[PDB]
Amino acid sequence: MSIAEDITQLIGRTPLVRLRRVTDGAVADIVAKLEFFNPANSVKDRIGVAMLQAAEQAGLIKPDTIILEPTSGNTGIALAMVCAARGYRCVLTMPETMSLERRMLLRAYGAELILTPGADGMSGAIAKAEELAKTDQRYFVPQQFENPANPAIHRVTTAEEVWRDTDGKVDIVVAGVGTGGTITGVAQVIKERKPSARFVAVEPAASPVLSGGQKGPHPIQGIGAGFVPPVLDQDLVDEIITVGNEDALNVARRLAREEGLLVGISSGAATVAALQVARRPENAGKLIVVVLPDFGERYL
């Protein structure tokens, strides 16, 4: 029988789909890895389960442990879902500016929210989690930007899925960088197995930090953290492509209307970059895999 014991056993193993229309000028094949197929509709389901699994396996979860993370994006959703499946108490800090829709989603999974001053933004949320954890030893903080289980799950799952599903023919992987876990884990496995493979990191033109520029505000949720992420192995990244806000939005729109792929704005951004790489004559005939991190319905 093929029956999962719980929802966390159904995370990952996401499909590839060939882009047919959003391919203007391409001389390479572009195929998209659809992370919206995860149970809570994003890539972060992988790291939500992986980080808790690593803690469990290291004996860090105690009978009175409470999971705690500062989060304004998909990792909060992923942790809330996984904690519901696990039977863990889950506390998430975030600015009081977070939408009522997002709060209802997290609360639907039974997570408890601590809202921090709007003016202090995400620094205030992080500060609150830091203080909570320092003063109450029940809290276990996954730390998505520093946890080695983040790139590790991408080595074990995402990378192998890309490898197997392309029968090792993948030539170039294009991925937005938030924590850097996805592109790092995939590159760690695939570049060592196929040294000719290349890896393109995608960031916002509005906050081109990996490119050597300065942090700034931008709407491409999921990428452009404003610092070099500790988990990112920059030596595995062969190129950085910056993407403008309007281009990201426009291509995200095109994916929905022309491919039936309703994806987030960071998926638009990743696809802008993949299409740029795909137009290069030296890439004629190559296979480009672009990661599409989440579903677009939350962004409407």
Q: Output the furthest CA–CA distance in the chain (Å, rounded).
A: 59
Torsion of CA 105, 107, 112, 117, to 10 degrees: 50
Give, as one character, the DSSP assignment of residue 155: I
The residues, ordered by sequence, that sit 6+ positions from 225 with a Cβ below 8 Å of its Cβ are: 145, 177, 178, 179, 209
194 contact, one of Cl ion, a copy of itself, none, CB 5-8 Å limit per kind: none
According to the binding rule CB under 8 A, does residue 39 interact with a copy of itself? yes
CB of 215 closer than 8 Å to CB of 209 = yes
Which residue's CB is nearer to Cl ion, number 71 or number 188?
71
182 binds Cl ion (CB under 5 A): no
Q: Classify 199 as helix, strand or coil.
A: strand
Q: Catalytic residue among 33, 266, 267, 286, which?
A: 266
Size of the site for a copy of itself (CB under 8 A): 54
Which of a copy of itself, Cl ion, none does 73 bind, CB closer than 5 to 8 A by kind? Cl ion
Active site residue 62: no
CA 35 – CA 12 distance, rounded (Å)? 8
Please name the residue that has the structure tokens 């609360």.
107
Angle at CA of residue 291, ends 286 and 292, nearest 5°: 130
Report whether 23 belongs to an annotated binding site.
no
Closer Cβ to a copy of itself, 203 or 259, answer by number: 259
Element (H, E) at 278: helix 265-278
Told to check if 73 binds Cl ion by CB under 5 A, we report yes
| Residue 31's binding partner out of a copy of itself, Cl ion, none, with CB under 5 to 8 Å set by partner kind | a copy of itself
Structural tokens at position 176: 């937005």
71 binds, among a copy of itself, Cl ion, none (CB under 5 to 8 A by kind): Cl ion
CB 84 within 8 A of CB 67: no
Task: Say whether residue 85 binds a copy of itself (CB under 8 A).
Answer: yes
Told to check if 119 binds a copy of itself by CB under 8 A, we report: no
- 42 part of the interface to Cl ion, by CB under 5 A: no
Q: Is 44 considered catalytic here?
A: yes
Q: Which is nearer to a copy of itself, 4 or 119 (CB)?
A: 4
Q: Per the annotation, where are the binding residues for pyridoxal 5'-phosphate?
A: 74, 178-182, 266
Active site residues: 44, 266
Q: Per the annotation, where are the binding residues?
A: 74, 178-182, 266
Note the residues at the interface with Cl ion (CB under 5 A).
Answer: 71, 73, 75
